[PDB]
Amino acid sequence: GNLLSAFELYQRNVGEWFEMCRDYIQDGHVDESGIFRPDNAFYLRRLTLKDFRRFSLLEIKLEEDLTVIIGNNGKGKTSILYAIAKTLSWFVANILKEGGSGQRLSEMTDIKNDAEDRYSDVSSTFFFGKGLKSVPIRLSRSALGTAERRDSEVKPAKDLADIWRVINEVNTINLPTFALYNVERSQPRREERFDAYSQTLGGAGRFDHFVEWYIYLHKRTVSSSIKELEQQVNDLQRTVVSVKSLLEQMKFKLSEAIERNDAAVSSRVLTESVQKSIVEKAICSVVPSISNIWVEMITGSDLVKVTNDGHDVTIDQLSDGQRVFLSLVADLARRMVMLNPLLENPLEGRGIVLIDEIELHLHPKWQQEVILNLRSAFPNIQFIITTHSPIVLSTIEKRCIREFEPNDDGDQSFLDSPDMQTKGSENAQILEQVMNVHSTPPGIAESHWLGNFELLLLDNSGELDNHSQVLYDQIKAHFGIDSIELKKADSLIRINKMKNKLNKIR
Amino acid sequence: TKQYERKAKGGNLLSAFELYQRNSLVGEWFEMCRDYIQDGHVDESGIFRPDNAFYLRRLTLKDFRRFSLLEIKLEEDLTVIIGNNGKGKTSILYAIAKTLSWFVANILKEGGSGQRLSEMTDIKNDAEDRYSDVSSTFFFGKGLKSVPIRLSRSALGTAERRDSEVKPAKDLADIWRVINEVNTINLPTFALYNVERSQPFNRNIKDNTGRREERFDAYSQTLGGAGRFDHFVEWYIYLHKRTVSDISSSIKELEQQVNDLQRTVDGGMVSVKSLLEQMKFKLSEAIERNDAAVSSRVLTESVQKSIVEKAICSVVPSISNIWVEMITGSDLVKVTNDGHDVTIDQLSDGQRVFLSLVADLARRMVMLNPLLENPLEGRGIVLIDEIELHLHPKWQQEVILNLRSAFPNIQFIITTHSPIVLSTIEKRCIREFEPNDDGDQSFLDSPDMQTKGSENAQILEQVMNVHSTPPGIAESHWLGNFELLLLDNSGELDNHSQVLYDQIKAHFGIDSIELKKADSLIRINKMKNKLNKIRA
Amino acid sequence: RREERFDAYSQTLGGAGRFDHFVEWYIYLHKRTVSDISSSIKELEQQVNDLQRTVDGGMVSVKSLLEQMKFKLSEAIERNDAVLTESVQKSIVEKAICSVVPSIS
Amino acid sequence: MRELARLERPEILDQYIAGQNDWMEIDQSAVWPKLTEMQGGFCAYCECRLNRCHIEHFRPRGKFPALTFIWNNLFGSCGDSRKSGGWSRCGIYKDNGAGAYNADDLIKPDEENPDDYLLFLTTGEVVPAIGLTGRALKKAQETIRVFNLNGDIKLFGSRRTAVQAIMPNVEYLYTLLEEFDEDDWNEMLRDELEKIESDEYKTALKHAWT
Numbered sequence A: 001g002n003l004l005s006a007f008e009l010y011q012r013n014v015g016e017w018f019e020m021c022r023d024y025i026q027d028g029h030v031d032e033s034g035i036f037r038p039d040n041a042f043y044l045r046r047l048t049l050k051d052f053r054r055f056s057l058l059e060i061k062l063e064e065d066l067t068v069i070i071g072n073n074g075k076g077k078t079s080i081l082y083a084i085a086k087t088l089s090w091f092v093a094n095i096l097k098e099g100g101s102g103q104r105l106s107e108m109t110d111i112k113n114d115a116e117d118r119y120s121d122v123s124s125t126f127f128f129g130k131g132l133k134s135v136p137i138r139l140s141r142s143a144l145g146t147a148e149r150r151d152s153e154v155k156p157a158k159d160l161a162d163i164w165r166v167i168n169e170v171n172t173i174n175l176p177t178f179a180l181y182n183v184e185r186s187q188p189r190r191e192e193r194f195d196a197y198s199q200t201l202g203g204a205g206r207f208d209h210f211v212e213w214y215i216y217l218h219k220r221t222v223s224s225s226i227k228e229l230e231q232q233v234n235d236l237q238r239t240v241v242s243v244k245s246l247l248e249q250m251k252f253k254l255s256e257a258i259e260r261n262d263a264a265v266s267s268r269v270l271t272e273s274v275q276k277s278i279v280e281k282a283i284c285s286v287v288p289s290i291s292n293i294w295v296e297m298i299t300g301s302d303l304v305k306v307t308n309d310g311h312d313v314t315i316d317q318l319s320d321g322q323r324v325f326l327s328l329v330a331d332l333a334r335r336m337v338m339l340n341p342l343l344e345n346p347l348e349g350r351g352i353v354l355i356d357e358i359e360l361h362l363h364p365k366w367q368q369e370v371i372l373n374l375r376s377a378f379p380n381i382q383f384i385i386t387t388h389s390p391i392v393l394s395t396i397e398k399r400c401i402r403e404f405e406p407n408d409d410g411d412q413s414f415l416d417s418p419d420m421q422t423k424g425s426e427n428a429q430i431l432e433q434v435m436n437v438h439s440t441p442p443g444i445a446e447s448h449w450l451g452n453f454e455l456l457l458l459d460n461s462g463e464l465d466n467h468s469q470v471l472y473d474q475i476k477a478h479f480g481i482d483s484i485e486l487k488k489a490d491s492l493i494r495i496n497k498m499k500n501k502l503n504k505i506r
Numbered sequence B: 001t002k003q004y005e006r007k008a009k010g011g012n013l014l015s016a017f018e019l020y021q022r023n024s025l026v027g028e029w030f031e032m033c034r035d036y037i038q039d040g041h042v043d044e045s046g047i048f049r050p051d052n053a054f055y056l057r058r059l060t061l062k063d064f065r066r067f068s069l070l071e072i073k074l075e076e077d078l079t080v081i082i083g084n085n086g087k088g089k090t091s092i093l094y095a096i097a098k099t100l101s102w103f104v105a106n107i108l109k110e111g112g113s114g115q116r117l118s119e120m121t122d123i124k125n126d127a128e129d130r131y132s133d134v135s136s137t138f139f140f141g142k143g144l145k146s147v148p149i150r151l152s153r154s155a156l157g158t159a160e161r162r163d164s165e166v167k168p169a170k171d172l173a174d175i176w177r178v179i180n181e182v183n184t185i186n187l188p189t190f191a192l193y194n195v196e197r198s199q200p201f202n203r204n205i206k207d208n209t210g211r212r213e214e215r216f217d218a219y220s221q222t223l224g225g226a227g228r229f230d231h232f233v234e235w236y237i238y239l240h241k242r243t244v245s246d247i248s249s250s251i252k253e254l255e256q257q258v259n260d261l262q263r264t265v266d267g268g269m270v271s272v273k274s275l276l277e278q279m280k281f282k283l284s285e286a287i288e289r290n291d292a293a294v295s296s297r298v299l300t301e302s303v304q305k306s307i308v309e310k311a312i313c314s315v316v317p318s319i320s321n322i323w324v325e326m327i328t329g330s331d332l333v334k335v336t337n338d339g340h341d342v343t344i345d346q347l348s349d350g351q352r353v354f355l356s357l358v359a360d361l362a363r364r365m366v367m368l369n370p371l372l373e374n375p376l377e378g379r380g381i382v383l384i385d386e387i388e389l390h391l392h393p394k395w396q397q398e399v400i401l402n403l404r405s406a407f408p409n410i411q412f413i414i415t416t417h418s419p420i421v422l423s424t425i426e427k428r429c430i431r432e433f434e435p436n437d438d439g440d441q442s443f444l445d446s447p448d449m450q451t452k453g454s455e456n457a458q459i460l461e462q463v464m465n466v467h468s469t470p471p472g473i474a475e476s477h478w479l480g481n482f483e484l485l486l487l488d489n490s491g492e493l494d495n496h497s498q499v500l501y502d503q504i505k506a507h508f509g510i511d512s513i514e515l516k517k518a519d520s521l522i523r524i525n526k527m528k529n530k531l532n533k534i535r536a
Numbered sequence C: 001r002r003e004e005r006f007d008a009y010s011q012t013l014g015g016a017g018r019f020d021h022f023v024e025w026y027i028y029l030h031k032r033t034v035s036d037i038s039s040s041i042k043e044l045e046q047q048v049n050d051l052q053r054t055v056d057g058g059m060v061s062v063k064s065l066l067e068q069m070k071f072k073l074s075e076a077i078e079r080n081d082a083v084l085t086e087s088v089q090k091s092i093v094e095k096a097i098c099s100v101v102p103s104i105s
Numbered sequence D: 001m002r003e004l005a006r007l008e009r010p011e012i013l014d015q016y017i018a019g020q021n022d023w024m025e026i027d028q029s030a031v032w033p034k035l036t037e038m039q040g041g042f043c044a045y046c047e048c049r050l051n052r053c054h055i056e057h058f059r060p061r062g063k064f065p066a067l068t069f070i071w072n073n074l075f076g077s078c079g080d081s082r083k084s085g086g087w088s089r090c091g092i093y094k095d096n097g098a099g100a101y102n103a104d105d106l107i108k109p110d111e112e113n114p115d116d117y118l119l120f121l122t123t124g125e126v127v128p129a130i131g132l133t134g135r136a137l138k139k140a141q142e143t144i145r146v147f148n149l150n151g152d153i154k155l156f157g158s159r160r161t162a163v164q165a166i167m168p169n170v171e172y173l174y175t176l177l178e179e180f181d182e183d184d185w186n187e188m189l190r191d192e193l194e195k196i197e198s199d200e201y202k203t204a205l206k207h208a209w210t
């Protein structure tokens, strides 16, 4: 079942080959959990970076569902996402237009500064079912002022994107979603299906765009044959003062019906009411502590309201963290609905979504919840995310985690999983075992007092001498009578007293 | 008068200054004012400490935004505001910044106006009195224990207007301005760093009009929220060019050119007289600038450069060196980041944002404190929103310590939601912000638990009300359930307890903390039972 | 705020007027008038009455629409029953404009 | 760190000779079972559970080519040089991280008892034992520095966690000194110390119990 061969036969000639291509893309099944699963999944399998920014050579194997990249500042987590996004730009460009050009590596910044061979390579391998097990793409750039230029190799991306484009032109199909949400998400004509690809790989997830869009959809969906509608409009026109508002509404409905009728097969779309419902469900399912979202006009101004932790509040009552996250989910849902019109649940569509610093502006409370329901709401999306949060990591399986060693001088060949299981683990353990940070701040003297106290007790055969008493009093004074530190000190005294008594009973 | 003389001799700064202004013993009163501002001592740690400290003591908000009444006491050194509701935390910083605008305006210009409260956004919507007040009290040594300032605004059409009361702030700022005019003094730094500081860096940097060299450019956009990292880059490149160049060589060259041109005019070439006059003007200007620079008692460009470089490298952990490279007729600032030489535009967002904050702050301090051996030991008030923005946990554990060590006399007022940051700060410095459904709150409380030197897990639970394990994961409850099963079956592993034990072992692993705790529970309960049998 | 009474003095002697402020204020008035259910009930009652007359006049094609509107009316009545100053203000201004401006009805 | 009982020399070390042969040539699966007998699947220096592991020359092969196929010089260390990653304690750190050291002033755990030099505080640190001066202090201080027995956060964190987990059981046993008679209590302490042969970080757990 080779898809490229089937498509080549289709192009040269014919109905049989078309149907084979269409079935390869569209066929799927509903699993035991009631979730639609494409028979031919699409995901990024492998990424290799050669002399790219800090990396002399880096190889990464990605999970089909969720990969979380962790490490210190300046380890290249953002660089990795950038590399992937530029590759994905070639698919998007060619879905939109034959021979469309994606993005390219910078000759100023993207070549490693001390690369002897003054060029950079980003090599990606994609998987699309057993018919197309390997789709290799390479983006290359030679440094500025080099005589010899290295060519990018993008034809496989173009070939695959051509299949999506051409088959869609004849008969509407579901399309993959590609989106990047970077840290800039936090910064303060009609609609058509392929607007879902507009600014998808930079500029997506902006709160203001959501609010505007949402109010717009509300106004349209407040308050069906064309001939019947034409007849109703004609009857209402003949009656026309009190029915004038109804006539205008019906004329709008007629125009919309004609437009839908006139609109091309490729640009087939769900009703605005359905779109609204799906986005609302997505938001309520994913976003911590939001159970409902709706538009009110009863003040006299258009206000988006939410039920947050059981209280109905204006969306401006949300924290910036919650707003930014709401914006991300809303934007993603909107694109999925536009690109997957033929699915019962359009959020079960295919795609690759990149998120930088998912915890951005989130209080610890909400960090504990954000990845619980992302995968539930978007089951067939490959998520590639970066985080600094041990709280986030406590909710994720170790297989999904790729960690940079703390002393990585940019040479190491593979990113690997942590040795300890993170999901369900204590944050203190994740800090030490996965993030290489002490649970207590080493730079604070008081952090060493219990250690010092223990040493003093052991030096004086377990008896509380003048020096040990002074330090004990300092611990008590500083941490308090009910402190865990004082309890530990008390415990040490008790144990050492008892040990010494035993020693005397020789 | 005799009363002013007595108060002035008693150490009252305002009385001393009033006597100075009237008589303009004029020299004596001037010296008293100048000594009040400039006197200080070096402590046992080798840090300069002003005898008369300047900091914000108290802030009160009345019918401001969501607050009917809010009172905050601030620490002299460090105050950290914590809470979910970040839109209220930010309102507090905004209120302070507007008040600080009044000092800045009046240091720059006599009768300068600071920022005012808005009738539309700053007044609480359900305020019965239909006005808002922001009241601040500052301290300036024992001579001036209270400098009260009130910013006020009434709604439109109210029967009585509410005017701001700013005269004390203006009077104090006037002392700084006037005394500085006569004899250079050190001046206080005021700055606000919002979440806006995280912006993309525009590389292409503007030609030197020479505003950036002026001392009071340190007050430009200082309370705007982003700082001006672009201004730093311009200023730093300027400093570099001056260090590489000789100073007064242009004057010497200009002196030589004016002398040569004078000889030509004396030789009968009257056509070049216009050019001579222009060049004489240029020479006079150069000398005056040199003299003004000399008169402004400013540090050498070499020294300024060194101070800032040291500051940046000390505070920003990934940066070991910063320098200007002269290539392609275009000056580039380079850094050694994690052992590798990169441009500023190649830095990670976290590194760049933090670099920008420290660089900006250091630049301003160097410009405003020319008379200190270490200009970073100057006075001032700095506001920082979300200090942990973009920082890895390892950096969060050092950020406050580094800042406080580099800027020992600055009053920092900061917001955070990081337990790791809180683990480095004393509970006295912490103010908790838990508002009602209306957003209103009356006082801000210190936490009950000591945070400094505490484990982050404890801070999470006891201060931030977050569990150590994620409650929405089943595996998070297995050890608790295991313990309960052990206690239910008189401490013996029954079929159910054994299954769960095996699940814990299978999921977390043989060397997991969780399994070790389970093993511990088994051992202790077995021993308890043995004791019970011996007793029976 | 456009609905604040003293907004009437905003740029009043600036020479242009603030026609933009009018439009915003008028849309505001409209939204508030639509939102109150009794006027909506009265309007819906009037629409139902007009549609019932059309059905009684032999136009069987609008019967489906009448049933929908009757349902909407019943729902509105069921939701809690209650004169808006905003409705009167709107009407006054509309009349003024139509009376003074000859081409506008 | 445990005192290790070295006993028998394996047969494969007879064949290979220093100078001619290299450590790349010799098979490593031949050597392991005797070290696993010696150590008990636990690291020589830190007492981790071994899974990623390598044969460690106590005096290194570069500086000391005489002691290349000698049974006294070999030890089972944690960490794996072959894998693309940074390991920061024991065998790997002794070479790369620690850098400059005198080999003579280190605890060789087959020859010497560690217990007289090292102490394990229940707060998690390893320190010199109470009352060391001059040369014995220098060995204790350098064993700690060169094997990075505090400076690795993974090790320090793992060791503290383990000891802190048993400190309820320690306090509870020593209370029952009073009411039990000596034969009951000494049997109990024997029984608890029986368990910790099979446990990770056994010397640290020993100092907590005794």
Ligand SMILES: Nc1ncnc2c1ncn2[C@@H]1O[C@H](COP(=O)(O)OP(=O)(O)O)[C@@H](O)[C@H]1O
Residues within 6 Å of the ligand: A052, A053, A054, A072, A073, A074, A075, A076, A077, A078, A079, A080, A109, A110, A111, A112, A113, A114, B337, B338, B340, B342, B346, B347, B348, B349, B350
């Ligand atoms: N061309 C380059 N040559 C060398 N190092 C580079 C280059 N471009 C960026 N870097 C380095 O890459 C790191 C930034 O990677 P980035 O993805 O921004 O980090 P993070 O993982 O914190 O997001 C820094 O250490 C920076 O010095």
Ligand SMILES: [Zn+2]
Residues within 6 Å of the ligand: D043, D044, D045, D046, D047, D048, D077, D078, D079, D089, D090, D091
């Ligand atoms: Zn080891």
